[PDB]
Amino acid sequence: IQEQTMLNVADNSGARRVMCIKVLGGSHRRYAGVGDIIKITIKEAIPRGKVKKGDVLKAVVVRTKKGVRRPDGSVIRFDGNACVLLNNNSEQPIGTRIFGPVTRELRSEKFMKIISLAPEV
């Protein structure tokens, strides 16, 4: 969701705040949604965990404020602006477990590791 901006980490190893710096997916991407990969910058980290301040990786957006909605138009929306890091050249999720509820748009066979953690939809 736009450059700058501040998300969380619904997984681990070097946590907390991590700013988006680039919305990937072609020129003039305006924002990123849940399911979208994004260029992040570790801006907090924990003394431990292989991830530390200033570090630049990619990351998906598991949850966010604008809210998901489709078919009928049921709109789930959180105020929990997620993330969940992504080690660079293989887009597999970097992190043991994952915190918080996710969604069915992440239900893709591409992330997968993500939707079988934090027991929730």
């Binding site: 489709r70 078919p71 009928d72 138009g73």
Partner: protein, 209 residues
């Protein structure tokens, strides 16, 4: 090549869990040929048809006489098609509200855009802006007009100078029709549809391809 009657509001049909379906439900009562244009005389092919019949007690004479066959009947508008093989009716020999479109084809709703009225370069075309740091005179509104200098400024009769938005036709083109209702003539489309309340509208066949 298909009736043309006013629409009225839009809805949602939720079953199997679409609900995305945003029906336009544009009633399309009787059509009635009223006139059949042909090669010799009338000019080209065509085939008039006044798909209406709104009680019009007071109407100018020529139109009131524009009808002539069996029941007579009167409407208001007056469209036509072209090549085909439609009847020789008048406002008699009804057409149908169930034109041949099978069940899963794309229609081509055509109406007159709403009317904003005079509108700035901001609303007319998404190209405009300006900031708020200084010079409030030319605030976030007025453009910076036609470039050029010594080229006297033939202004290239365009850009996008402010001017009324118009009510001009639109023709959304391509819109899968969901329902029809043979006798309770409504015919639902999928969103779009220009105009409001009950604009004439046209709803063509599928030329968009």
């Amino acid at each position: 090549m298909i009736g043309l009657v006013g629409k009225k509001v839009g809805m949602t049909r939720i079953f199997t869990e679409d609900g995305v379906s945003i029906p336009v439900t544009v009633i399309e009562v009787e059509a009635n040929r009223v006139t059949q244009v042909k090669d010799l005389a009338n000019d080209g092919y065509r085939a008039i048809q006044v798909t209406t019949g709104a009680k019009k007690a007071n109407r100018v004479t020529k139109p009131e006489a524009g009808h002539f066959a069996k029941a007579g009947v009167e409407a208001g508008r007056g469209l036509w098609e072209f090549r085909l093989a439609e009847g020789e009716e008048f406002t008699v020999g009804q057409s149908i509200s169930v034109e041949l479109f099978a069940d899963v084809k794309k229609v081509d709703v055509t109406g007159t855009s709403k009317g904003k009225g005079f509108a700035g370069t901001v609303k007319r075309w998404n190209f405009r802006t300006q900031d708020a740091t200084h010079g409030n005179s030319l605030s976030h509104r007025v453009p910076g007009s036609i470039g050029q200098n010594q080229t006297p400024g033939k202004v290239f009769k365009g850009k996008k100078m402010a001017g009324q938005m118009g009510n001009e036709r639109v023709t959304v083109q391509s819109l899968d029709v969901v329902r029809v209702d043979a006798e309770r003539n409504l015919l639902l489309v999928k969103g779009a549809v220009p105009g409001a309340t009950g604009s004439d509208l046209i709803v063509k066949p599928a030329v968009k391809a």
